[PDB]
Amino acid sequence: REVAMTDLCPAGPIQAVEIQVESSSLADICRAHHAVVGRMQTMVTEQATQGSSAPDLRVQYLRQIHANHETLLREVQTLRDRLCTEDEASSCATAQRLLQVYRQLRHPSLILL
Amino acid sequence: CTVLLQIMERESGNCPKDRYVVCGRVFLSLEDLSTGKYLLTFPKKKPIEHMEDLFALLAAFHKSCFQITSPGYALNSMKVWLLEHMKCEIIKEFPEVYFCERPGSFYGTLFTWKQRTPFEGILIIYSRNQTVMFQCLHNLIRILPINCFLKNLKSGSENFLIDNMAFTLEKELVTLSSLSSAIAKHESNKVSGALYREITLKVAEVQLKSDFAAQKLSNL
Amino acid sequence: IISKSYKALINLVQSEQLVEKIWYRVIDDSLVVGVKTTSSLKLSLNDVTLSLLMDQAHDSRFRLLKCQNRVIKLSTNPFKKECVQIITAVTSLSPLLTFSKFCCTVLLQIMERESGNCPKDRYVVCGRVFLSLEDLSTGKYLLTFPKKKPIEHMEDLFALLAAFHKSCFQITSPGYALNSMKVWLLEHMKCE
Amino acid sequence: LNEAMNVSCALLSSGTGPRPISCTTSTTWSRLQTQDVLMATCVLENSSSFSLDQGWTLCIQVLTSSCALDLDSACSAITYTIPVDQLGPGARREVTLPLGPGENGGLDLPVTV
Amino acid sequence: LNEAMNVSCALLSSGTGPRPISCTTSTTWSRLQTQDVLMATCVLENSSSFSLDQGWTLCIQVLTSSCALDLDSACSAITYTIPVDQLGPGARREVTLPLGPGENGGLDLPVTVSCTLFYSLREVVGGQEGVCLPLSRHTVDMLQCLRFPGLAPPHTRAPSPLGPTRDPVATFLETCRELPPSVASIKVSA
């Protein structure tokens, strides 16, 4: 579907096309995301060296994205340190939380502008 | 038969490296078998001292990988079930392989036992069909503790897959923090869409790793 | 009333034992079922088969089950005189040991060939095999070689004449006589 | 049981069209590995109201050539037996079988399934 | 050796779109027994005059999931191979080999078929080993694997597969011993 987003771009929300996938199995989401990201890598590297580049805002939302990424980065680092120390509940809730982080990140992923 | 070993690089998405090697040639004849020389035919070739012969087992035998946890209790009854009940010989050369010599319907079966964190071990069954892998878990489940949680493993152990997932996500989150930090010095010096594209390609290259490790974990 | 109605179905469809008995062995990863005929059932006149059928109580899922059909004719002490025709199925085991256990039922189907009406499509339920891992862990049905060299339950011969890859060769020695066979068999091959 | 009697009675009567349950089979070439294999689709269809519940099972038998010989063949016939579960009215299954040369490049034709 | 040199030049040189020799790798669904299975038709085509005569052989090699897994998989990959015997001008052949579900929906999907030819003279007469030309490396993604039963052209009653509720070895183990939809998305410039 088409989704125009004004607080990404400074002037013109291009009417950026969003691509979604919903399933019971997170495995099939991993796979179909993996496939599509592959196809977008291909398209963007064949279009680059010919196509131009739009400007961004530089402000507010790239910083929102920085903050919400840095909290999860330090959380993953604390989780890795805990996995190295090996106290108790070796890796069950750790897996269940890491995959929560994964799902959280995947829903918006690579707004390409 | 000519033998041909192809080598492909993963890291380079250019398919640049398609190196082939020719590692020699196999001749074989009905006479050469008629006179043994190559064959593995059982109990005569019990004392395993040509390691090629071990390797031709661990190739042609159906394998099956199993996670074991006795969570509130240490696990050493494995070592007794292998050496006394199943009547195993350790191969000295490779002391992590056990060859079953009990002389009814487990003869010529091989195991391996990595006991990492003596609660949480891992057991791998090379067998001469499936019915023999079943006969074994049956016979094993009989001897284990009450809490002992078996599990089938297609594609590696849970500790390694969580480490793989953790690494791929830490890398990706580092790349996105890097995106925003490269934007946050451009502000001090409106963004180059070219720069944004350049960094999204690196982020894509790490996202493909996280998606892969996630499909490994989400089946388990 | 339920019992009345079971028997009612069976009399709805419609004495002489067409079939001696059921027997079975486990070869390695092969189940062999076999049944011994009586003189009444003539394999000259009747194409027969045999199936196995899984208990859906155990089999919650649609696995198709495949069963290979072999007919075995052995002459008994020829040197009237007894022919022994037996009929036998083979399938894979490991698929059926999913639940530690199963019970299959055994269905011998018979169809005439001479009458082109397809008139006579009789069947019979020849019995039921229970099998488990506590059975096989105690041997009891296996054939495990050389311990079970001295062949004295003929079911165990019939299991090996089922399971095995059969191949028939003609031998013509056209400028000799051919007697070297028995020696090759008894001396070079060391046949009982 | 009631329904079973009713299906059975329906089947065993010759109403001049085999209404209640049908089972058509039909030949199809496929390709495997290198060789053209000959497959048979078995379509089971429920036309009538009667839902074929649990307790039902389909048996297929694939009879080779006729005339029992001097030498009893390798494989006289093959049999295939599948649970039909909750078929229902209008509803339908399909099963594919090979008949085809797996041994020897040798298929002998007049074959009944 | 002439024909080898002529063909080998024709492939590697002329860095253009249309080669003389091709290896097109599709995917298909066909039905066996009860399951559906995933086929790769590999179609080898000889659009040139060169006639791959003899001593030419074709190695297809099907690589699974790509990662350094700790224990290992029972089957890292497969490979096939075939003497290509005459294969004159315009002519072609086809080879269906399964990728399809390994034992319990067991199908990790990045999966590449990678074709190669292989010329060795050691075949005809020697004197010195052999040569591997690559040829189509296609990958299979998830998105070719998806099948659309409700949307389908026929609108025919195919039964819903409902892939197996456990592994056979898992059911064995449970017997012997006794929610929201996940989502992902992307945005991209019109």
User: Hey, are the CB atoms on E67 and B18 less than 8 Å from each other?
Assistant: no
Q: Are C166 and D74 in contact (CB under 8 A)?
A: yes
Name the one residue in this structure whose structure tokens are 């580049």. A53
- Shortest distance between the Cα of E92 and any Cα of chain B, in A, equals 25
State which amino acid sits at residue A2: E
Candidates B69, B164, B173: best to mutate against A (most CBs of A within 10 A) is B173
Q: Are B181 and A66 in contact (CB under 8 A)?
A: yes
User: Hey, are the CB atoms on D92 and E157 less than 8 Å from each other?
Assistant: yes
Strands (E) in chain B, as ranges, are 2-8, 18-25, 63-69, 88-90, 97-100, 110-114, 120-126, 149-153
Going by C-beta distance under 8 Å and a sequence separation of 6 or more, which residues neighbour residue A110?
A: A37, A40, B200, B203, B204, B207, E186, E187, E188
Interchain CB contact of C57 with E (< 8 Å): no
Q: Are E97 and E39 in contact (CB under 8 A)?
A: yes
- Shortest distance between the Cα of A49 and any Cα of chain E, in A, equals 16
Rounded-to-integer distance, Cα B195 and Cα B203, Å: 12
* Phi-psi sector, A64: left (phi>0), alpha (psi -120 to 50), beta: alpha
In terms of DSSP H, where are the helices of chain A? 26-47, 61-85, 93-106
User: In terms of Cα–Cα distance, which of B210, B196, C47, B162 is closest to D77?
Assistant: C47
User: Hey, are the CB atoms on B179 and A65 less than 8 Å from each other?
Assistant: yes
Rounded-to-integer distance, Cα E148 and Cα E150, Å: 6
Cα nearest neighbour of E184 on chain A:
A107
DSSP H or E run through B59 = helix B51-60
Chains that touch B (3 or more CB pairs under 8 A): A, C, E
Residues 24 to 83 of D: which have CB under 8 A from any E CB? 30-34, 82
List B150's β-bridge partners, or say none.
B68
- Shortest distance between the Cα of A84 and any Cα of chain E, in A, equals 17
Technique used: cryo-EM
List C73's β-bridge partners, or say none.
C85
Name the one residue in this structure whose structure tokens are 């079943």. B134
List chain B residues with CB under 8 Å of A56: 183, 190-191, 193, 196
Which among B103, B130, B138 has CB closest to C29? B130
Rounded-to-integer distance, Cα E34 and Cα E55, Å: 41
Query: Other C-beta atoms within 10 Å of D92: how many?
Result: 16
User: Hey, are the CB atoms on B177 and A73 less than 8 Å from each other?
Assistant: yes
Using a threshold of 3 CB pairs under 8 A, tell whether chains B and E touch.
yes
Interchain CB contact of D96 with E (< 8 Å): yes
User: Hey, are the CB atoms on D80 and C67 less than 8 Å from each other?
Assistant: yes
Query: Other C-beta atoms within 10 Å of E140: how many?
Result: 21
How far CA B31 is from CA of B25, B36, B50, B166, C184, in Å, comes to 18, 9, 22, 56, 17
Interchain CB contact of C84 with D (< 8 Å): no
User: In terms of Cα–Cα distance, which of C73, C6, C13 is closest to C37?
Assistant: C73
Q: Are E45 and E95 in contact (CB under 8 A)?
A: no
* Phi-psi sector, B78: left (phi>0), alpha (psi -120 to 50), beta: alpha
Chains that touch D (3 or more CB pairs under 8 A): C, E
Chain A and chain B share a number of CB contacts under 8 A equal to 136
Interchain CB contact of A108 with B (< 8 Å): no
Interchain CB contact of A32 with B (< 8 Å): no
Give the relative orientation of helices A26-47 and B193-219 as an angle to the nearest 10 degrees. Answer: 160
Phi, psi of C26 (to 5 degrees): -110, 125
Q: What is the DSSP string of B15-33?
A: ---EEEEEEEE----HHHH
List chain B residues with CB under 8 Å of E134: 15, 18
List chain E residues with CB under 8 Å of B2: 120, 122, 129-130
Which among B103, B130, B135 has CB closest to C133? B135
| Token representation of residue E25 | 């790798």
List chain E residues with CB under 8 Å of C95: 168
Rounded-to-integer distance, Cα B77 and Cα B86, Å: 12
Rounded-to-integer distance, Cα E80 and Cα E115, Å: 10
Rounded-to-integer distance, Cα D107 and Cα C190, Å: 37
List chain B residues with CB under 8 Å of A34: 208, 211-212, 215
State which amino acid sits at residue C154: M
Rounded-to-integer distance, Cα C53 and Cα C129, Å: 10
List chain E residues with CB under 8 Å of D91: 157
| Token representation of residue D47 | 């036309």
Rounded-to-integer distance, Cα E114 and Cα E25, Å: 9
List chain A residues with CB under 8 Å of E109: 31
Q: What is the DSSP string of E34-65?
A: SSEEEEEEEEEEE-SS----SSEEEEEEEE--
Q: Are C24 and C129 in contact (CB under 8 A)?
A: yes
Q: Are B107 and B101 in contact (CB under 8 A)?
A: yes
Interchain CB contact of E167 with B (< 8 Å): yes
| Token representation of residue C68 | 């290979």
Header resolution in angstroms: 4.2
| Token representation of residue E165 | 């509720």
Interchain CB contact of A101 with B (< 8 Å): yes
Chain B and chain E share a number of CB contacts under 8 A equal to 76
| Token representation of residue E79 | 């490979």
Rounded-to-integer distance, Cα C105 and Cα C128, Å: 4
- Shortest distance between the Cα of C91 and any Cα of chain B, in A, equals 13
User: Hey, are the CB atoms on C49 and D77 less than 8 Å from each other?
Assistant: yes
Do you know the residue count of chain E? Answer: 190
Residues 114 to 153 of E: which have CB under 8 A from any B CB? 114, 116, 118, 120, 122, 129-130, 132, 134, 137
Interchain CB contact of C64 with D (< 8 Å): yes
Interchain CB contact of D86 with E (< 8 Å): no
State which amino acid sits at residue A5: M
List chain E residues with CB under 8 Å of B26: none
List chain C residues with CB under 8 Å of B131: 26, 28-29, 93-94, 97, 136
User: In terms of Cα–Cα distance, which of B67, B133, B64, B123 is closest to B98?
Assistant: B123
List chain C residues with CB under 8 Å of D12: 12-13
User: In terms of Cα–Cα distance, which of D22, D90, D26 is closest to D58?
Assistant: D22
| Token representation of residue D90 | 């209008």
Cα nearest neighbour of A43 on chain E:
E188
- Shortest distance between the Cα of D34 and any Cα of chain C, in A, equals 24
Burial of A10 (0-12, 13-18, 19+ CB in 10 A): middle
Which among E141, E181, E186 has CB closest to A23? E181
| Token representation of residue A32 | 């179909």
- Shortest distance between the Cα of D64 and any Cα of chain C, in A, equals 9
Chains that touch A (3 or more CB pairs under 8 A): B, E
Q: Are D35 and D94 in contact (CB under 8 A)?
A: no
Candidates E23, E58, E63, E69: best to mutate against B (most CBs of B within 10 A) is E69
Q: Are B129 and C91 in contact (CB under 8 A)?
A: no
Q: Are B198 and B139 in contact (CB under 8 A)?
A: no
| Token representation of residue B129 | 């069909």
User: Hey, are the CB atoms on E41 and D30 less than 8 Å from each other?
Assistant: no
Interchain CB contact of E125 with A (< 8 Å): no
| Token representation of residue E185 | 């998305």
User: Hey, are the CB atoms on D9 and C62 less than 8 Å from each other?
Assistant: no
Q: Are B162 and B214 in contact (CB under 8 A)?
A: no
Considering just the CA atoms, what is the radius of gyration of chain B in Å? 25
Q: Are strands C123-132 and C51-54 parallel, antiparallel or unpaired?
A: unpaired
Using a threshold of 3 CB pairs under 8 A, tell whether chains B and A touch.
yes
